[PDB]
Design an enzyme around this catalytic site. Structure first.
Site, PDB file in Angstrom:
ATOM      1  N   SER A 147      33.650 -23.675  34.055  1.00 42.76           N
ATOM      2  CA  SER A 147      34.133 -24.436  35.218  1.00 42.76           C
ATOM      3  C   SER A 147      33.006 -24.499  36.253  1.00 42.76           C
ATOM      4  O   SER A 147      31.922 -24.970  35.916  1.00 42.76           O
ATOM      5  CB  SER A 147      35.471 -23.872  35.730  1.00 42.76           C
ATOM      6  N   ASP A 248      39.604 -33.183  31.063  1.00 44.30           N
ATOM      7  CA  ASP A 248      39.624 -31.896  31.749  1.00 44.30           C
ATOM      8  C   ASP A 248      40.578 -31.952  32.948  1.00 44.30           C
ATOM      9  O   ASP A 248      40.551 -32.896  33.756  1.00 44.30           O
ATOM     10  CB  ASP A 248      38.190 -31.563  32.205  1.00 44.30           C
ATOM     11  N   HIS A 294      42.891 -26.892  31.047  1.00 42.83           N
ATOM     12  CA  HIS A 294      42.051 -26.108  31.939  1.00 42.83           C
ATOM     13  C   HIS A 294      41.558 -24.837  31.275  1.00 42.83           C
ATOM     14  O   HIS A 294      40.997 -23.976  31.965  1.00 42.83           O
ATOM     15  CB  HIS A 294      42.787 -25.776  33.250  1.00 42.83           C
TER      16      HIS A 294
HETATM   17  C1  RFO Z   1      38.295 -25.695  37.855  1.00 36.18           C
HETATM   18  O1  RFO Z   1      37.122 -25.781  38.646  1.00 36.18           O
HETATM   19  C2  RFO Z   1      36.824 -27.096  39.076  1.00 36.18           C
HETATM   20  C3  RFO Z   1      35.427 -27.077  39.554  1.00 36.18           C
HETATM   21  O2  RFO Z   1      34.783 -26.074  39.735  1.00 36.18           O
HETATM   22  N1  RFO Z   1      34.873 -28.330  39.891  1.00 36.18           N
HETATM   23  C4  RFO Z   1      35.559 -29.604  39.691  1.00 36.18           C
HETATM   24  C5  RFO Z   1      34.627 -30.690  40.121  1.00 36.18           C
HETATM   25  C6  RFO Z   1      33.290 -29.965  40.320  1.00 36.18           C
HETATM   26  C7  RFO Z   1      31.996 -30.449  40.513  1.00 36.18           C
HETATM   27 CL1  RFO Z   1      31.854 -32.168  40.624  1.00 36.18          CL
HETATM   28  C8  RFO Z   1      30.881 -29.586  40.627  1.00 36.18           C
HETATM   29  C9  RFO Z   1      31.107 -28.208  40.517  1.00 36.18           C
HETATM   30  C10 RFO Z   1      32.370 -27.686  40.340  1.00 36.18           C
HETATM   31  C11 RFO Z   1      33.483 -28.583  40.218  1.00 36.18           C
END
Ligand code: RFO
Ligand code: NAG
Length: 350
Positions: A147, A248, A294
């Site tokens: 993630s 996702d 997820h």
């Molecule tokens: C479950 O976690 C979601 C998450 O961490 N994110 C969801 C969009 C995103 C971007 Cl665009 C960069 C870094 C982390 C991000």
């Protein structure tokens, strides 16, 4: 079993958001020269107000004060071959995410800063301290993450490789495994910070850093582009295996999709999967199942999903072999082509 032991960083100036020391959980495997360093995820925060709220009710993601002294390694961090057919004998490292910066920050708490954002320095310091605990003998260091930690891999793998070269360890092969961190800067299904804006703000708030070749392409003010896998990946030199659900759940959340589906949403979801597949076409080491999920690679049942009959532990093993022409019966590029969540029967059941 609670097999990974906490070590708080000996350089206590490398801190979590609240200035408590960052750290890592370690289980050594004597005689293995493989090291798995896993970056935890957990979204991010990008201003005083949203970081203060995270500090109140997601404090383990901002502080080490309440961390347990051990953790159980699960999924790819498991030392049992039945749970982890891939790397069960490796040295295992779990690096808690306590910097809220997608592992990009290099700023200390201070005078002008309520919080420290030191994700990129935490990785550097963990690597430095592990060199004295056996990492100096490694043949492969796999920097993995899920993630926000998966995006963290993309942002940091080449810096780890460069750090080890500069420190005098050119024989350690640094590779990345980015799980669920390959996002699209696409239009929301319904308008609601579409990530692009939050990350743009984050970079300034965190003093956030991106890989150098990507930074040189996009230039000042545009470094947020490097947080998007399809833009940063082509600039990376280290081998990187990408795991990403085609649908996702977090991508859908930032797209303001919340699941009888009518035509407009059906088209939106189908287009999302096709776009994701498109961005992975030229990623030779990838595992991208057509699921709405997820779930991440440190879950105990990570072995169960297959693409085209091949599990992720098998694909990762094939990847190892490829880094010793494609291999007979041992594929590394595994992207579903069916167009709707759960058209792959092996998707996680929920
Ligand atoms: C479950 O976690 C979601 C998450 O961490 N994110 C969801 C969009 C995103 C971007 Cl665009 C960069 C870094 C982390 C991000
Ligand atoms: C401690 O970490 C900070 C942040 O990277 C660095 O500036 C400093 O040199 C480190 N000190 C030691 C003794 O490693």
């Amino acid at each position: 079993n609670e097999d990974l032991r906490l070590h708080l960083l000996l350089n206590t100036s490398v801190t979590c958001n609240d200035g408590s020391p960052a750290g890592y959980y370690l289980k050594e495997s004597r005689g293995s020269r493989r090291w798995l360093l896993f970056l935890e995820g957990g979204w991010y925060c990008f201003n005083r107000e949203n970081c203060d709220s995270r500090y109140d009710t997601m404090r383990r993601l901002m502080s080490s004060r309440d961390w347990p002294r051990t953790r159980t390694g699960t999924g790819i961090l498991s030392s049992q071959p039945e749970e982890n057919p891939y790397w069960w004998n490796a040295n295992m490292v779990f690096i808690p995410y306590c910097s809220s910066d997608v592992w990009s920050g290099a700023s200390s708490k201070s005078e002008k800063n309520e919080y420290a954002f030191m994700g990129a320095l935490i990785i550097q310091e963990v690597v430095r301290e592990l060199l004295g605990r056996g990492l100096s003998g490694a043949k492969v260091l796999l920097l993995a993450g899920s993630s926000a930690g998966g995006t963290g891999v993309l942002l940091n793998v080449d810096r780890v490789a460069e750090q080890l070269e500069k420190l005098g360890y050119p024989a350690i092969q640094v590779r990345g495994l980015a799980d669920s961190g390959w996002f699209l800067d696409n239009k929301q299904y319904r308008h609601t910070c579409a990530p692009t804006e939050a990350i743009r703000r984050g970079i300034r708030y965190w003093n956030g850093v991106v890989p150098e070749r990507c930074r040189r392409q996009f230039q000042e003010g545009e470094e947020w582009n490097c947080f998007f896998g399809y833009k940063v990946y082509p600039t990376l030199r280290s081998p990187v295996f990408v795991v990403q659900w085609l649908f996702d759940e977090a991508q859908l959340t930032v797209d303001n999709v919340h699941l009888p589906v009518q035509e407009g949403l059906r088209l939106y979801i189908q287009n999302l999967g096709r776009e994701l597949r498109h961005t992975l076409k030229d990623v030779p080491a990838s595992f991208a199942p057509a699921c709405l999920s997820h779930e991440i690679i440190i879950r105990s049942h990570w072995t169960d999903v297959q693409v085209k009959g091949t599990s992720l532990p098998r694909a990762l093993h094939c990847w190892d072999r490829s880094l010793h022409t494609p291999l007979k019966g041992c594929p590394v590029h595994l992207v579903d082509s069916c167009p709707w969540p759960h058209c792959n029967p092996s998707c996680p059941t929920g």
